[PDB]
Amino acid sequence: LSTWQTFRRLWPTIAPFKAGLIVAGVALILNAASDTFMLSLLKPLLDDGFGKTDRSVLVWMPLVVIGLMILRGITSYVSSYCISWVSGKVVMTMRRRLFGHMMGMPVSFFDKQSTGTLLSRITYDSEQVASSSSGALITVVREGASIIGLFIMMFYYSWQLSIILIVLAPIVSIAIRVVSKRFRNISKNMQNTMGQVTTSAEQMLKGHKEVLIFGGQEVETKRFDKVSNRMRLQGMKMVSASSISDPIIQLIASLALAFVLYAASFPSVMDSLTAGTITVVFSSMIALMRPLKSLTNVNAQFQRGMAACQTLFTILDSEQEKDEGKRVIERATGDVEFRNVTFTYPGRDVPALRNINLKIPAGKTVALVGRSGSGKSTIASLITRFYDIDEGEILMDGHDLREYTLASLRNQVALVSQNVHLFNDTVANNIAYARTEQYSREQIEEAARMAYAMDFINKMDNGLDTVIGENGVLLSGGQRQRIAIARALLRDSPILILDEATSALDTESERAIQAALDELQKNRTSLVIAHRLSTIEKADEIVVVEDGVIVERGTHNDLLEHRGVYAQLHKMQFG
Amino acid sequence: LSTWQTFRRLWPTIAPFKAGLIVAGVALILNAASDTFMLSLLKPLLDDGFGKTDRSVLVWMPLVVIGLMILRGITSYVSSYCISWVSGKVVMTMRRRLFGHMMGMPVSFFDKQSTGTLLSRITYDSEQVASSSSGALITVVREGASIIGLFIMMFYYSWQLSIILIVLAPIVSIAIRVVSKRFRNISKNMQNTMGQVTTSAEQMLKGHKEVLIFGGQEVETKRFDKVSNRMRLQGMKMVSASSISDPIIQLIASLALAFVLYAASFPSVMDSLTAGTITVVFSSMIALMRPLKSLTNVNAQFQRGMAACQTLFTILDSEQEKDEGKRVIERATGDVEFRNVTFTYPGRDVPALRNINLKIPAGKTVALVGRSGSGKSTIASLITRFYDIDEGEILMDGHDLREYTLASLRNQVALVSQNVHLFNDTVANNIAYARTEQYSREQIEEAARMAYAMDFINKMDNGLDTVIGENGVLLSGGQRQRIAIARALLRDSPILILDEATSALDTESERAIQAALDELQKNRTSLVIAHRLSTIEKADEIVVVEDGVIVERGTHNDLLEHRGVYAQLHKMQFG
């Protein structure tokens, strides 16, 4: 079906590791051959061994069995380890490609699908594809070699008896299937009437409140006596019908065995039939029962594996960042204009952002206080060329963002918030996530001192080289904000956007936070998601954001004099 | 444990059917003996059969095999059928006892447990007890006989080899267990670090929004390269640790087999060891593996069965109707008085009925219109000695119900409603649920014509002997009410209580319903759950019922003049 197409597309990944696959295949063939030779040992043991008084075969058999199982163990370990090497390298390469494609893909993908299922796709599914493919490979190779060995042995010892058994087995299978089907039909046919007797017994108990008033408690007893006799007789009849089935299957199996014995009684075949050839052939026939089932299930398992591969290939080779710009900023002035911008979250409705006329000049500050969601958070996300507007205009330095590459545009905008991301590395490297080669330690320590992050780094183990714990084990919210301030200060980003909604005012030592904030907000463009009073009054411009469109544009004194929604928000301390 | 006492208490039920159990046991023993004899047949076939040129064993073997397995089939059928007879009769008796106890049990039990689970207890659990007990008996008897036969064969052919195998098996088992335990410990020990590697990979993808702004997309690629190296190496080490295990188990098993062969090589045992004795002993040892597992699981199966039996016995030997009366009603006058009655539904709180002062004289009519639930339905249920009052007094004919038996008290009260239970029997027997032997057909047909049910009985198949379909297939709501009216009319019950809440006024032919009603309400005591206007104005007394206590007591004109809750209910047509 479509499995072979996906496998053909996937094969170039597995191509360079042909040596491991060849070693695994040779090992699996040797393993199956060793097992079939172990079965073949049954002839000398039972023919020239136990039977005679010669203590030759019986005294060498233990050593041969030990050697064969040493070979089987070594071979099994080799095959498992080499198939594991191939599977591990393929999984590593595919996870690496999937992740390298994952970063550099629109945030829309990362909000549509939760973060957890992304890790699931990277680990579990990319493990399942190779696990199922390798299982299919080892099953096919090993069981095919085992079946070939068993058939070669069977036809090598006594071909007449082998032919008899081979032509006889399908008839037995067909008869068993027919008998089972017929008696299953009988069972369901009687389940049909179980339904009605059960519903009658149910109806019997549904009128207890009408039995008591009328005094008819004996009549109900007689009726249940009759219905219980009905139930018992019918259950008896099912048991008889079901117990008629299995003896028939057993009888046809015994008849097949008796026919094989009778055929062997004839002189045509018995000439090549000793006491050990029978034991070898009739045991090979038994041992050739599990490989057949494994070969039957291998196709379904491989199809499942290739379906998982197709899902992963759907995640791969998909949309990416809509990079369409040409020019690169050296240093932006900072003036940004939102005009006639109407933007909607992809995959949703009820537009939240529409018809703005906002201007932020260089060196000034604009607040974006909103009720709960408003459009301030959307504006902060959008200004860094996250989810793009459906229609509108965004003018930075007199040019739009669409014409401008989204590789240097993000470099000139800084994000400051309490919910900043800290990753497991040294603090001297967490500062300046990138550009760790052209930013010397002198600037790093100067920025750390300016951001007042030197106060707690000194009182910590290893100093500037402390490795951050998993998911912020060491650093706290205020410390995280200070490290983000350090990042924004070290990189001379002309435009910054800062958030205060997730910030908690209960923590002490906020004087250093305010000092770092005012140090960062020095002669550079700044957008403030304001909910703290001290960050509101000195702001040059305040633009309260309501759902859809803004409704306030003025200073704090003007808005207070207007007695609008700004005063109401100030009454509740802006939430 | 607790199984044996429950089985001892249950045994008297199974005692009279000892013959079926004996036949089943003898059959199971014969079946196991036939199987062991078939395994024993391998010696003549392989020793002086195939091996030699004697044309004796190989020609009789088909006939002997066919005869043995015909015996096995016939015997299996006999054992199954007789154990089914015993199980079916035990189940019938136990269901009969359980149902006979269920009727005559306080309604409180029937409302505490849903109607469905009672049918489940009667059918499924009472089947499970006998099914598990019979399965335990069959497993114990058959597998014990099979094990005894196989051990007798093994020690009869070659006692030295049998002793070697018996003393060799436990140490092999112990070694397998310890190896498996050690490698499972290794696997979990490394899963421990899989957890932290996975959480690091999770942390990698949780900061995509902070990778883009800072431009550090290559650094994340390098970090994931290193963590993917970690993942692949550690998964490799998992696979190596897991794959080291199974070859060890195979090697110890083969070492045990090699030791058996080497021991057989000695002249102490090899003297009594031919080419067929080996094939019989080493195949009996294989056949002695599944009976052991069945014998191990039989105890758990029997314990589950006896736990189900204990649950059923908990349903049995439980509370019943609190019969405490002495005398018997001949014909009550009809006057009833509820004085200072405060009653609560058992198992709940918020008492529904408290401090009632109601008097209903003989031949009078009293309405009990309530908003939705009120206490009208509770009073109607309680008047027939359903759930009993916590404290209060109910005076009928000047005596209380507690002193008066709840076997003739229910006989004189009639219940009329649209939700009247009809059962699958002839309509001539649906009327007069009981007393079908002292009530001649003349009275039945006169009551049918008086209740105006004769109109639709004539226009239906079989006339008066029509068998009602399952759950009211034939009769309708109006016909159900008419048949209930016929029941209440044929039995000259001095006191009747009628409901109208469940009745629907959309159905036509209500003139016959009204005629049946006013014919029924003729010179006898009647309590009316009034929601229909035509049964309200003609009522001599109306008592509006509110939550807890009644609030109104007067005729329709007086209640309308009072302009109380009765007028408001009349505005909405009493719901």
Count other C-beta atoms under 10 Å from residue A156's C-beta.
Answer: 12
Strands in B378-520 per DSSP E: 391-396, 399-400, 413-416, 495-499
Q: 3-class DSSP state for residue B540?
A: coil
- Over its C-alpha atoms, chain A yields an Rg (Å, rounded) of 40
Q: What are the residue ranges spanned by the domains of chain A?
A: 3-317, 336-573
Write the DSSP assignment of B273-295 as a string of letters. --TTHHHHHHHHHHHTSHHHHHH
With CA atoms as reference, the chain B residue closest to A246 would be: B73
Put simply, whether A67 touches B (Cβ < 8 Å) is no
Alpha helix positions (H), B206-276 = 208-214, 217-243, 245-265, 267-270
Interchain proximity A221–B100, CB inside 8 Å: yes
At residue B359's C-alpha, the angle toward residues B356 and B360, to 5°, is 135
Query: What resolution does the deposited structure have, in angstroms?
Result: 3.6
On whether the CB atoms of residues A402 and A484 are closer than 8 A, the answer is: no
CA distance B374 to B467: 38
Tokens, residue B519: 């014919």
Q: Sheet holding B399-400: strands in order across?
A: B353-360, B336-343, B391-396, B399-400
Shortest Cα–Cα distance, A556 to chain B (Å)? 31
DSSP state of A466: P
Residues of A in contact with B224 (CB under 8 A): 96, 99-100
What are the CB-based long-range contacts (under 8 Å, 24+) for A61-64? A61/B258, A61/B261, A62/B258, A62/B259, A62/B261, A62/B262, A62/B265, A63/B258
Q: Measure the CA–CA gap between A298 and B88, rounded to whole angstroms.
A: 45
Q: Please judge whether A213 and B423 are an interchain contact, meaning their C-beta atoms are less than 8 angstroms apart.
A: no
Instruction: Check: CB of residue A241 under 8 Å from CB of residue A190.
Output: yes
Q: Does domain B3-317 have CATH number 1.10.3720.10?
A: no
Write the secondary structure of A287-318 as one string of H (helix), E (strand) and C (coil).
HCCHHHHHHHHHHHHHHHHHHHHHHHHHHCCC
Tell me the C-alpha distance between A226 and B424, whole Å. Answer: 13
B157: which residues sit within 8 A by CB, 6+ positions away? B43, B277, B280, B281
Contact status of A70 with chain B (Cβ, < 8 Å): yes
Cα separation values, B168 from A15, A66, B442, Å? 49, 17, 87
Give the whole-angstrom CA distance, residue B68 versus residue B74.
10
The DSSP result for A168-221, as a single string, is: HHHHHHHHHHHHHHHHHHHHHHHHHHHHHHHHHHHHHHTTHHHHHHHT-HHHHH
Q: Are B526 and B536 in contact (CB under 8 A)?
A: no
Chain B, residues 83-142, CB within 8 A of chain A, namely 84-85, 88-89, 91-92, 95-96, 99-100, 102-104, 107, 110, 115-116, 118-119, 122-123
Longest dimension (CA), chain A: 120
Among A502, A281, A482, smallest CA distance to A372 is for A502
Do residues B250 and A69 lie in contact, with contact meaning Cβ atoms separated by under 8 Å?
yes
- B-chain residues near A213 (CB < 8 A): 384, 410, 413-415
Query: In Å, how far is B532's CA from the nearest CA of chain A?
Result: 24
Q: In Å, what is the CA distance from B352 to each residue of A243, B189, B286, B347, B372?
A: 57, 62, 71, 13, 13
CA of B210 vs chain A CAs: smallest distance (Å)? 7
Residues 6+ apart with CB under 8 A from B23: B78, B79, B82
A402 Cβ partners below 8 Å, 6+ apart?
A: A324, A325, A388
Nearest to B278 among A46, A66, A262 (CB): A46
> Strand pairing partners for B515?
none
Chain B residues in contact with A49 by the CB 8 A cut-off are 275
Q: For A537-554, b where at least 16 C-beta lie within 10 A, e where not — what string? A: eebebbbbbebbebebeb
Decide if A224 and B411 are in contact by the 8 Å CB cutoff: no
Residue B422 tokens read as 């009809």
Q: Beta B365-367 vs B391-396: how paired, if at all?
A: unpaired
Report in angstroms the alpha-carbon separations of A549 from A181, A369, A392, A500, A530.
Answer: 71, 13, 14, 21, 17
Q: Kindly write down the DSSP assignment for every residue of A403-428, as one continuous string.
A: TB-TTTTGGGEEEE-SS----SSBHH
- In this structure, chain A runs to a length of 575
Experimental method: cryo-EM
A42 token code pair: 């049954």
- The token pair at A403 is 């014409």
Is A190's Cβ below 8 Å from some Cβ in B? no
Burial of B465-477, coded b for 16+ CB within 10 Å and e otherwise, reads ebebeeebeebeb
Chain B, 290-319: which have a CB under 8 Å from a chain A CB? none
CB contact under 8 A, B254 and A65: yes
How many angstroms separate the CA atoms of B446 and B454, rounded? Answer: 9
Residue A88 and residue B424: Cβ atoms within 8 Å?
A: no
Amino acid (1-letter code) at residue A473 = V
Nearest chain A residue to B93, by CA: A228
Residues 481-520 of chain B whose Cβ lies under 8 A from any Cβ of chain A: 487, 491
Opening angle at CA A93, ends A89 and A99, nearest 5: 145
Stated as kind and residue range, the H or E segment containing A116 is: helix A115-120
Burial class (CB in 10 A: 0-12, 13-18, 19+), B391: exposed
Contact check, Cβ <8 Å, A232/B89: yes
Q: Determine how β-strand B353-360 pairs with β-strand B525-529.
A: unpaired
CB-CB contact of B151 with B166 (8 Å): no
User: Minimal Cα distance from A201: which residue of B?
Assistant: B119
Distances, alpha carbon A402 to alpha carbons A356, A411, A412, A496, in Å: 18, 16, 16, 20
How far is Cα B201 from Cα A112, in angstroms, rounded to an integer? 20
Beta-carbon separation of B420 and A200 below 8 A: no
Maximum Cα–Cα distance across chain B: 120
The two tokens of residue A392 are 């509108």
Class of domain B336-573: alpha beta
